[PDB]
Amino acid sequence: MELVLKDAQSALTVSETTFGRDFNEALVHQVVVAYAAGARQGTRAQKTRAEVTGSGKKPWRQKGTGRARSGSIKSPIWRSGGVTFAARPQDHSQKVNKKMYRGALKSILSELVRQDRLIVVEKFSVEAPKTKLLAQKLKDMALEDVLIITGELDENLFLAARNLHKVDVRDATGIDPVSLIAFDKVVMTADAVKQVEEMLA
Amino acid sequence: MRLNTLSPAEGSKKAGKRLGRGIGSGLGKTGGRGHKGQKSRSGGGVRRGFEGGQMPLYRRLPKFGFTSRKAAITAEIRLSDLAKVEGGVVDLNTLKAANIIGIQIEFAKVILAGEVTTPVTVRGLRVTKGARAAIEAAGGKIEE
Amino acid sequence: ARVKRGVIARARHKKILKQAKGYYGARSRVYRVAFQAVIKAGQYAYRDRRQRKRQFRQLWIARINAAARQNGISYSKFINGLKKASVEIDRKILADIAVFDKVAFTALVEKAKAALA
Amino acid sequence: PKIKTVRGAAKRFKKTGKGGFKHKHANLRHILTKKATKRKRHLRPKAMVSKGDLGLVIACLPYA
RNA sequence: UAGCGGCGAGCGAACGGGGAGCAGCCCAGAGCCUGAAUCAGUGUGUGUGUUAGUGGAAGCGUCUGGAAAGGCGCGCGAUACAGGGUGACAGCCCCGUACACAAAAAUGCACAUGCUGUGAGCUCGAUGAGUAGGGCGGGACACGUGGUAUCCUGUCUGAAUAUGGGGGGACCAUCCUCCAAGGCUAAAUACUCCUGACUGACCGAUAGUGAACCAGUACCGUGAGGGAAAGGCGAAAAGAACCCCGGCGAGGGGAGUGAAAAAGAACCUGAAACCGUGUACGUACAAGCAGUGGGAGCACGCUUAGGCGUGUGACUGCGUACCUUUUGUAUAAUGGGUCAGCGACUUAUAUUCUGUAGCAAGGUUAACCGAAUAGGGGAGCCGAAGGGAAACCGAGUCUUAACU
């Protein structure tokens, strides 16, 4: 219906942006956990091989010499070397189905109602590459270091947001809930881009 | 109104809860409670791929001759759809969406199956009583 | 990726090693004690507290048998007199009356002596 | 990837209208069938229950 | 999968489909024309990289502290808040940083050029003989001679030559397809002594390289060869003038440095074993896994007694450690002297159940593309039909001559 009172803007809008599921944690929690393991083309786990500097086969004479019972020396018990069931680079990256990917995302609007679901503009008048007076625009809603991300969808000069960690752009189709939920009030914005099945920002 | 008693409380994301049950047998290792052992604990097959007792023999008894229908597969054309995503020119060869023969093939022969026509110059070479008597609200044809 | 056992390693040994008594030699100084001795303590303890309920009873009757008989009727006959009553049955334990309220006790032996049919 | 045991395929591959792939039958055939007449009709195949579970693993995607 | 295989173990295709990439040309020869496209080596130029670089923003105050980057107040930069460094953690102190410039010369690749060689183009021709087959022996084709096609052959033979010759898995006919015995050709794959930048749910001095340190050193061996131990004062050396005991010792005690020397060079924190001095109690006529249950006394502590807390424990009931291995389990069966750190059901893909979520007679994509977690891609996999060994039939179908 209404997206609560909108500051500076007449109001917001009434788009579908998915049936409007409730949440069902189970699902998103998986895609989320699954998201923290995507760009994993590879991963160290360097230190390995049960065949360390094994510059030799058993030279300790088995029967006799008193207490003994040695053998090789990549021996998992020998303080010398040998790390057991070694280790490995692996993949990590689990893959979430396609449908499960789009399932339950922007549940933000309804729940985070009195917080996030704002739609305005991508700030068109912003200088060539200027972040300094971002504050002027960072105050049209009074959402600053509170975090928030924009979803204008135009790799224009608005990628200006550079800071320890406050405003992030990524204004484009490419965007996962992980980010949408990492910020206080993801300024959807974009306008019209937020259609039905393609509410992709 | 924002209260200056110092902490926001809007509603953005932070996160989005979760997807189902089961996210770790508890492996990645063994260490911790229960002191696992694996190599299933006994002392027989330790490293995998030790399908001791090949599935073959003792299961591998008696093996009838056989061959292969060189028919590609002669897909039936289909679930009694002919005519309607069937190009509505009713005949049949290949460029279809809802029900398609997929093209690589010799012949068809349609069974009758799902819901039929309302219009249908049925060809497809093909047959069946399922066909002659259900598709028959329209266009017989068979040709060769 | 760090067991770094050191981390609870210490706490565990220290825990059982905490046997104030010290007991004797290795029984405190060496970890060897714990499941060997600190464990025995738990075992010897497990049975003694519950087995004790009787060890005192054996004493309770040991004195009643030693007090009540001196003034007629043995412990064997005593509880039998006492046995007959509508409300008169107050058990032993307090039975030590022979130490503080002798008059009561000897006035209680009649409650049985004269009681025995 | 899980490798189906290609043997059992040739053996009892099937899947009636509800799994329980109907193995097959026949005994002494193609060795000693110079014995018995009635008690030897190929009829058709059949599956099992106490044993089905073991014969289950092959297939996955309907193949043939 | 087909097939091969003591048809053992095991070996293991292709047709065909989806893509990355994508171009074809020379001699077997003469004539006409005639230095023409095409390459190669070279001098040159331009683009764009490699080898030095240049500019590059914006902070004061007060508090604590040895020291401010930290607290608190306000203030400014941001196409720069990557990172590092600075006396505790800095966007605004320094190096950088986004961005924007830059090369005498020297070279990589591109295009362009000149020189040299090459030789275009048209016509009419020519068309790869010890070769193809084949007998013997072998090797290669997924194919272990098998009925074994085809490829290369050691060895011995040996043809037609384009109305001719090869192939289509023994072989023959027919049909189809292609020209072998001559050659060239752009567009990926492997590895790390080393180079610079960068990253890490990688270690943090028994770890991690053998080596964080004058380590392949000291050592050990005839030798080849083997192969260590070993980090930390503090912010600052301000590393302790001077005085005193002493052998012009060692060692220490003051004084001074310092926030600290309960940081003094053995130097951060400093545990455990192990070794002492002091104090409370027990203890020299009493037998044993040394405790546990009961328990008086004594030393302190209790309280406006109230019958208690801490230590120690005379006397007394009980009563043979742990481990291992064993029938033996107190067992005299196994394992463990003790402590600290490390030490064992993981991982990948496949298959099947259960729970849960999506969608539904439909569900789902793979590689790959990519305005990369989107969207696109439905090749394909599974299910809605089954029966029969199969052809085949099909809610039926096999069985049988049978309709039961």
Ligand SMILES: [Mg+2]
């Ligand atoms: Mg040995």
Ligand SMILES: [Mg+2]
């Ligand atoms: Mg166990």
Ligand SMILES: [Mg+2]
């Ligand atoms: Mg085990």
Ligand SMILES: [Mg+2]
């Ligand atoms: Mg076993």
Ligand SMILES: [Mg+2]
């Ligand atoms: Mg067993």
Ligand SMILES: [Mg+2]
């Ligand atoms: Mg066997």
Ligand SMILES: [Mg+2]
């Ligand atoms: Mg530990």
Ligand SMILES: [Mg+2]
């Ligand atoms: Mg008593």
Ligand SMILES: [Mg+2]
């Ligand atoms: Mg069915």
Ligand SMILES: [Mg+2]
């Ligand atoms: Mg470069």
Ligand SMILES: [Mg+2]
């Ligand atoms: Mg810090």
Ligand SMILES: [Mg+2]
């Ligand atoms: Mg050490």
Ligand SMILES: [Mg+2]
């Ligand atoms: Mg200092």
Ligand SMILES: [Mg+2]
């Ligand atoms: Mg004393």
Ligand SMILES: [Mg+2]
């Ligand atoms: Mg106390």
Ligand SMILES: [Mg+2]
């Ligand atoms: Mg003994």
